[PDB]
Design a protein around this ligand. Sequence first.
Ligand SMILES: [Ca+2]
Ligand SMILES: [Ca+2]
Ligand SMILES: [Ca+2]
Ligand SMILES: [Ca+2]
Lengths: 89, 89, 75, 75
Amino acid sequence: MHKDELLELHEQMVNIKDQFLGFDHVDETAFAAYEELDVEPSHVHKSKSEHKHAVFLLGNALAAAMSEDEFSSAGRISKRMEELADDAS
Amino acid sequence: MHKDELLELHEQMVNIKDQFLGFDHVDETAFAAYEELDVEPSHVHKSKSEHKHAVFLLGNALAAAMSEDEFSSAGRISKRMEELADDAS
Amino acid sequence: MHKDELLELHEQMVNIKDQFLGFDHVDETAFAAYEELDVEPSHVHKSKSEHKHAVFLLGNALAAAMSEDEFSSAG
Amino acid sequence: MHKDELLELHEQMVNIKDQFLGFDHVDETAFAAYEELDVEPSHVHKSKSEHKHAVFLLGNALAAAMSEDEFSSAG
Ligand SMILES: [Ca+2]
Ligand SMILES: [Ca+2]
Ligand SMILES: [Ca+2]
Ligand SMILES: [Ca+2]
Protein backbone atom coordinates (compact mmCIF):
# COMPACT_ATOMS: atom_id res chain seq x y z
CA MET A 1 0.00 0.00 0.00
CA HIS A 2 1.51 3.31 -1.15
CA LYS A 3 1.65 6.38 1.07
CA ASP A 4 -0.73 8.40 -1.14
CA GLU A 5 -3.23 5.47 -0.98
CA LEU A 6 -2.98 5.35 2.83
CA LEU A 7 -3.49 9.14 3.14
CA GLU A 8 -6.59 8.82 0.92
CA LEU A 9 -7.85 5.93 3.08
CA HIS A 10 -7.33 7.99 6.25
CA GLU A 11 -9.18 11.00 4.59
CA GLN A 12 -12.19 8.84 3.78
CA MET A 13 -12.30 7.16 7.22
CA VAL A 14 -12.43 10.66 8.67
CA ASN A 15 -15.39 11.32 6.34
CA ILE A 16 -16.98 8.14 7.89
CA LYS A 17 -16.30 9.47 11.43
CA ASP A 18 -17.90 12.82 10.66
CA GLN A 19 -20.85 11.04 9.02
CA PHE A 20 -21.31 8.87 12.19
CA LEU A 21 -21.06 11.84 14.59
CA GLY A 22 -23.82 13.42 12.59
CA PHE A 23 -26.25 10.60 13.42
CA ASP A 24 -29.09 10.52 15.85
CA HIS A 25 -28.25 9.53 19.37
CA VAL A 26 -24.78 8.30 18.77
CA ASP A 27 -21.87 8.01 21.15
CA GLU A 28 -19.95 11.20 20.57
CA THR A 29 -16.92 9.94 22.46
CA ALA A 30 -16.51 6.88 20.22
CA PHE A 31 -13.36 8.02 18.63
CA ALA A 32 -11.52 9.20 21.65
CA ALA A 33 -8.59 6.90 21.11
CA TYR A 34 -8.08 8.14 17.53
CA GLU A 35 -8.02 11.75 18.83
CA GLU A 36 -5.34 10.85 21.41
CA LEU A 37 -3.07 9.77 18.58
CA ASP A 38 -3.31 13.24 17.00
CA VAL A 39 -2.48 11.91 13.55
CA GLU A 40 -4.69 13.43 10.93
CA PRO A 41 -5.18 13.24 7.20
CA SER A 42 -3.63 16.66 6.65
CA HIS A 43 -0.45 15.53 8.41
CA VAL A 44 1.04 14.41 5.12
CA HIS A 45 4.55 14.40 6.42
CA LYS A 46 3.97 11.99 9.24
CA SER A 47 4.94 8.33 8.77
CA LYS A 48 3.15 5.53 6.91
CA SER A 49 3.10 3.81 10.33
CA GLU A 50 1.38 6.72 12.07
CA HIS A 51 -1.25 6.78 9.30
CA LYS A 52 -1.84 3.02 9.47
CA HIS A 53 -2.24 3.42 13.24
CA ALA A 54 -4.79 6.19 12.71
CA VAL A 55 -6.81 4.11 10.26
CA PHE A 56 -6.64 1.19 12.72
CA LEU A 57 -8.07 3.34 15.51
CA LEU A 58 -10.89 4.60 13.25
CA GLY A 59 -11.92 1.15 11.99
CA ASN A 60 -11.70 -0.27 15.45
CA ALA A 61 -13.72 2.51 16.91
CA LEU A 62 -16.46 2.30 14.35
CA ALA A 63 -16.79 -1.43 15.10
CA ALA A 64 -16.83 -0.85 18.87
CA ALA A 65 -19.62 1.70 18.43
CA MET A 66 -21.71 -0.84 16.47
CA SER A 67 -21.08 -3.38 19.18
CA GLU A 68 -22.15 -1.00 21.98
CA ASP A 69 -25.21 0.02 20.11
CA GLU A 70 -26.24 -3.65 19.67
CA PHE A 71 -25.35 -4.75 23.24
CA SER A 72 -27.56 -1.81 24.36
CA SER A 73 -30.61 -2.45 22.20
CA ALA A 74 -30.92 -6.13 21.40
CA GLY A 75 -28.80 -6.97 24.41
CA ARG A 76 -31.49 -5.43 26.55
CA ILE A 77 -34.28 -7.58 25.07
CA SER A 78 -32.02 -10.67 25.61
CA LYS A 79 -31.34 -9.72 29.22
CA ARG A 80 -35.05 -9.17 29.74
CA MET A 81 -36.00 -12.50 28.15
CA GLU A 82 -33.54 -14.26 30.41
CA GLU A 83 -34.92 -12.47 33.48
CA LEU A 84 -38.46 -13.55 32.48
CA ALA A 85 -37.46 -17.24 32.02
CA ASP A 86 -35.81 -17.17 35.45
CA ASP A 87 -39.08 -15.77 36.79
CA ALA A 88 -40.76 -18.52 35.11
CA SER A 89 -38.95 -21.10 37.15
CA MET B 1 -29.13 5.85 15.02
CA HIS B 2 -31.93 5.72 12.43
CA LYS B 3 -32.20 2.97 9.83
CA ASP B 4 -31.60 5.34 6.89
CA GLU B 5 -28.43 6.62 8.68
CA LEU B 6 -27.19 3.04 9.20
CA LEU B 7 -27.83 2.11 5.54
CA GLU B 8 -25.85 5.21 4.49
CA LEU B 9 -23.03 4.24 6.87
CA HIS B 10 -22.96 0.71 5.44
CA GLU B 11 -22.92 2.18 1.82
CA GLN B 12 -19.92 4.35 2.62
CA MET B 13 -18.00 1.57 4.42
CA VAL B 14 -18.46 -0.48 1.26
CA ASN B 15 -16.96 2.47 -0.65
CA ILE B 16 -13.98 2.23 1.83
CA LYS B 17 -13.68 -1.54 1.15
CA ASP B 18 -13.64 -1.04 -2.61
CA GLN B 19 -11.11 1.80 -2.20
CA PHE B 20 -8.84 -0.52 -0.10
CA LEU B 21 -9.10 -3.45 -2.55
CA GLY B 22 -7.95 -1.06 -5.21
CA PHE B 23 -4.63 -0.45 -3.45
CA ASP B 24 -1.21 -1.78 -4.23
CA HIS B 25 -0.31 -5.08 -2.70
CA VAL B 26 -3.18 -5.37 -0.32
CA ASP B 27 -4.73 -8.44 1.24
CA GLU B 28 -7.63 -9.19 -1.04
CA THR B 29 -9.16 -11.63 1.42
CA ALA B 30 -9.38 -9.04 4.20
CA PHE B 31 -13.09 -8.82 4.20
CA ALA B 32 -13.93 -12.44 4.04
CA ALA B 33 -15.96 -12.39 7.22
CA TYR B 34 -18.13 -9.50 5.97
CA GLU B 35 -18.85 -11.50 2.77
CA GLU B 36 -19.93 -14.54 4.82
CA LEU B 37 -22.62 -12.42 6.42
CA ASP B 38 -24.11 -11.62 2.99
CA VAL B 39 -25.70 -8.42 4.24
CA GLU B 40 -25.24 -5.62 1.79
CA PRO B 41 -26.14 -1.98 1.46
CA SER B 42 -28.78 -2.69 -1.16
CA HIS B 43 -30.55 -5.09 1.22
CA VAL B 44 -32.71 -2.29 2.54
CA HIS B 45 -35.28 -4.61 3.97
CA LYS B 46 -32.95 -6.51 6.22
CA SER B 47 -32.81 -5.60 9.92
CA LYS B 48 -31.06 -2.72 11.68
CA SER B 49 -29.19 -5.49 13.54
CA GLU B 50 -27.96 -7.17 10.35
CA HIS B 51 -26.73 -3.79 9.08
CA LYS B 52 -24.96 -2.96 12.34
CA HIS B 53 -23.32 -6.40 12.15
CA ALA B 54 -22.17 -5.69 8.59
CA VAL B 55 -20.67 -2.34 9.55
CA PHE B 56 -18.97 -4.03 12.52
CA LEU B 57 -17.36 -6.62 10.23
CA LEU B 58 -16.16 -3.91 7.83
CA GLY B 59 -14.64 -1.67 10.52
CA ASN B 60 -13.08 -4.64 12.20
CA ALA B 61 -11.66 -5.94 9.01
CA LEU B 62 -10.16 -2.65 7.96
CA ALA B 63 -8.41 -2.45 11.34
CA ALA B 64 -7.15 -6.04 11.12
CA ALA B 65 -5.69 -5.29 7.67
CA MET B 66 -3.79 -2.27 9.08
CA SER B 67 -2.52 -4.43 11.89
CA GLU B 68 -1.30 -7.19 9.52
CA ASP B 69 0.34 -4.70 7.28
CA GLU B 70 2.24 -3.18 10.25
CA PHE B 71 3.15 -6.53 11.90
CA SER B 72 4.55 -7.49 8.45
CA SER B 73 6.61 -4.38 7.72
CA ALA B 74 7.75 -2.77 10.94
CA GLY B 75 7.30 -6.04 12.76
CA ARG B 76 9.96 -7.49 10.51
CA ILE B 77 12.51 -4.78 11.33
CA SER B 78 11.73 -5.34 15.07
CA LYS B 79 12.18 -9.09 14.76
CA ARG B 80 15.44 -8.50 12.91
CA MET B 81 16.73 -6.02 15.49
CA GLU B 82 15.99 -8.52 18.23
CA GLU B 83 17.77 -11.29 16.32
CA LEU B 84 20.83 -9.01 15.91
CA ALA B 85 20.95 -8.12 19.65
CA ASP B 86 20.78 -11.82 20.49
CA ASP B 87 23.69 -12.32 18.09
CA ALA B 88 25.40 -9.65 19.87
CA SER B 89 25.40 -11.56 23.09
CA MET C 1 -22.33 -21.78 25.08
CA HIS C 2 -23.88 -22.33 28.51
CA LYS C 3 -24.00 -19.62 31.21
CA ASP C 4 -21.65 -21.51 33.54
CA GLU C 5 -19.08 -21.84 30.70
CA LEU C 6 -19.41 -18.11 29.95
CA LEU C 7 -18.98 -17.04 33.62
CA GLU C 8 -15.87 -19.26 33.66
CA LEU C 9 -14.53 -17.61 30.49
CA HIS C 10 -15.16 -14.18 32.04
CA GLU C 11 -13.32 -15.27 35.25
CA GLN C 12 -10.30 -16.39 33.26
CA MET C 13 -10.20 -13.26 31.10
CA VAL C 14 -10.16 -11.27 34.34
CA ASN C 15 -7.18 -13.44 35.34
CA ILE C 16 -5.55 -12.35 31.98
CA LYS C 17 -6.31 -8.69 32.80
CA ASP C 18 -4.73 -8.89 36.22
CA GLN C 19 -1.69 -10.69 34.76
CA PHE C 20 -1.24 -7.95 32.02
CA LEU C 21 -1.64 -5.12 34.56
CA GLY C 22 1.15 -6.78 36.49
CA PHE C 23 3.58 -6.36 33.60
CA ASP C 24 6.40 -3.86 33.17
CA HIS C 25 5.45 -0.51 31.65
CA VAL C 26 1.98 -1.46 30.44
CA ASP C 27 -0.99 0.82 29.76
CA GLU C 28 -2.87 0.71 33.04
CA THR C 29 -5.96 2.23 31.43
CA ALA C 30 -6.30 -0.41 28.74
CA PHE C 31 -9.39 -1.86 30.22
CA ALA C 32 -11.35 1.23 30.90
CA ALA C 33 -14.27 0.37 28.73
CA TYR C 34 -14.68 -2.95 30.51
CA GLU C 35 -14.76 -1.11 33.88
CA GLU C 36 -17.46 1.19 32.54
CA LEU C 37 -19.66 -1.83 31.92
CA ASP C 38 -19.41 -2.89 35.58
CA VAL C 39 -20.17 -6.50 34.77
CA GLU C 40 -17.87 -8.79 36.70
CA PRO C 41 -17.29 -12.46 37.11
CA SER C 42 -18.86 -12.52 40.51
CA HIS C 43 -22.13 -11.07 39.13
CA VAL C 44 -23.60 -14.49 38.55
CA HIS C 45 -27.08 -13.22 38.36
CA LYS C 46 -26.52 -10.83 35.52
CA SER C 47 -27.50 -11.84 31.97
CA LYS C 48 -25.63 -14.11 29.54
CA SER C 49 -25.73 -11.01 27.28
CA GLU C 50 -24.05 -8.82 29.91
CA HIS C 51 -21.33 -11.43 30.34
CA LYS C 52 -20.70 -12.00 26.62
CA HIS C 53 -20.35 -8.27 26.37
CA ALA C 54 -17.85 -8.15 29.21
CA VAL C 55 -15.79 -10.93 27.59
CA PHE C 56 -15.97 -8.93 24.32
CA LEU C 57 -14.61 -5.81 26.04
CA LEU C 58 -11.73 -7.75 27.66
CA GLY C 59 -10.67 -9.51 24.45
CA ASN C 60 -10.90 -6.30 22.55
CA ALA C 61 -9.03 -4.38 25.14
CA LEU C 62 -6.13 -6.83 25.09
CA ALA C 63 -5.83 -6.79 21.36
CA ALA C 64 -5.96 -2.99 21.38
CA ALA C 65 -3.14 -2.89 23.91
CA MET C 66 -0.99 -5.27 21.82
CA SER C 67 -1.65 -3.09 18.76
CA GLU C 68 -0.72 0.15 20.57
CA ASP C 69 2.42 -1.42 21.77
CA GLU C 70 3.25 -2.67 18.24
CA PHE C 71 2.32 0.65 16.50
CA SER C 72 4.53 2.38 19.22
CA SER C 73 7.55 0.03 19.04
CA ALA C 74 7.54 1.02 15.35
CA GLY C 75 8.67 4.52 16.25
CA MET D 1 6.63 -5.56 28.91
CA HIS D 2 9.44 -8.12 29.13
CA LYS D 3 9.68 -11.15 26.82
CA ASP D 4 9.11 -13.65 29.63
CA GLU D 5 5.92 -11.77 30.66
CA LEU D 6 4.74 -11.77 27.02
CA LEU D 7 5.40 -15.52 26.51
CA GLU D 8 3.41 -16.08 29.73
CA LEU D 9 0.53 -13.93 28.43
CA HIS D 10 0.56 -15.89 25.16
CA GLU D 11 0.51 -19.20 27.13
CA GLN D 12 -2.51 -18.09 29.12
CA MET D 13 -4.40 -16.80 26.09
CA VAL D 14 -3.86 -20.23 24.54
CA ASN D 15 -5.39 -21.64 27.74
CA ILE D 16 -8.41 -19.29 27.06
CA LYS D 17 -8.61 -20.58 23.47
CA ASP D 18 -8.64 -24.20 24.53
CA GLN D 19 -11.26 -23.43 27.21
CA PHE D 20 -13.55 -21.63 24.61
CA LEU D 21 -13.15 -24.46 22.06
CA GLY D 22 -14.33 -26.77 24.81
CA PHE D 23 -17.67 -24.97 25.07
CA ASP D 24 -21.08 -26.00 23.78
CA HIS D 25 -21.89 -25.01 20.21
CA VAL D 26 -19.02 -22.58 19.69
CA ASP D 27 -17.41 -21.50 16.41
CA GLU D 28 -14.51 -23.91 16.09
CA THR D 29 -12.90 -21.76 13.40
CA ALA D 30 -12.77 -18.60 15.48
CA PHE D 31 -9.07 -18.68 15.78
CA ALA D 32 -8.08 -19.34 12.26
CA ALA D 33 -6.08 -16.22 11.78
CA TYR D 34 -4.00 -17.02 14.84
CA GLU D 35 -3.26 -20.50 13.40
CA GLU D 36 -2.14 -18.90 10.15
CA LEU D 37 0.51 -16.98 12.06
CA ASP D 38 2.00 -20.22 13.44
CA VAL D 39 3.50 -18.46 16.43
CA GLU D 40 2.95 -20.48 19.57
CA PRO D 41 3.77 -20.26 23.21
CA SER D 42 6.42 -22.89 22.96
CA HIS D 43 8.30 -20.88 20.28
CA VAL D 44 10.45 -19.15 22.85
CA HIS D 45 13.01 -18.14 20.36
CA LYS D 46 10.69 -16.21 18.12
CA SER D 47 10.54 -12.40 18.39
CA LYS D 48 8.73 -10.26 20.97
CA SER D 49 6.98 -8.80 17.88
CA GLU D 50 5.81 -12.24 16.71
CA HIS D 51 4.43 -12.94 20.17
CA LYS D 52 2.67 -9.58 20.62
CA HIS D 53 1.08 -10.27 17.29
CA ALA D 54 -0.06 -13.70 18.35
CA VAL D 55 -1.59 -12.27 21.55
CA PHE D 56 -3.28 -9.63 19.36
CA LEU D 57 -4.82 -12.31 17.13
CA LEU D 58 -6.10 -14.31 20.13
CA GLY D 59 -7.67 -11.31 21.89
CA ASN D 60 -9.21 -10.16 18.68
CA ALA D 61 -10.48 -13.56 17.82
CA LEU D 62 -12.24 -13.92 21.16
CA ALA D 63 -13.91 -10.57 20.92
CA ALA D 64 -15.00 -11.36 17.36
CA ALA D 65 -16.54 -14.62 18.54
CA MET D 66 -18.44 -12.86 21.37
CA SER D 67 -19.70 -10.30 18.84
CA GLU D 68 -20.87 -12.95 16.36
CA ASP D 69 -22.65 -14.73 19.08
CA GLU D 70 -24.30 -11.46 20.25
CA PHE D 71 -25.19 -10.27 16.68
CA SER D 72 -26.66 -13.85 16.15
CA SER D 73 -28.60 -14.15 19.43
CA ALA D 74 -30.29 -10.95 18.20
CA GLY D 75 -32.06 -12.88 15.46
CA1 LIG E 1 -6.02 16.17 16.90
CA1 LIG F 1 -22.72 -11.30 -0.74
CA1 LIG G 1 -16.70 -2.48 38.52
CA1 LIG H 1 0.60 -23.88 14.33
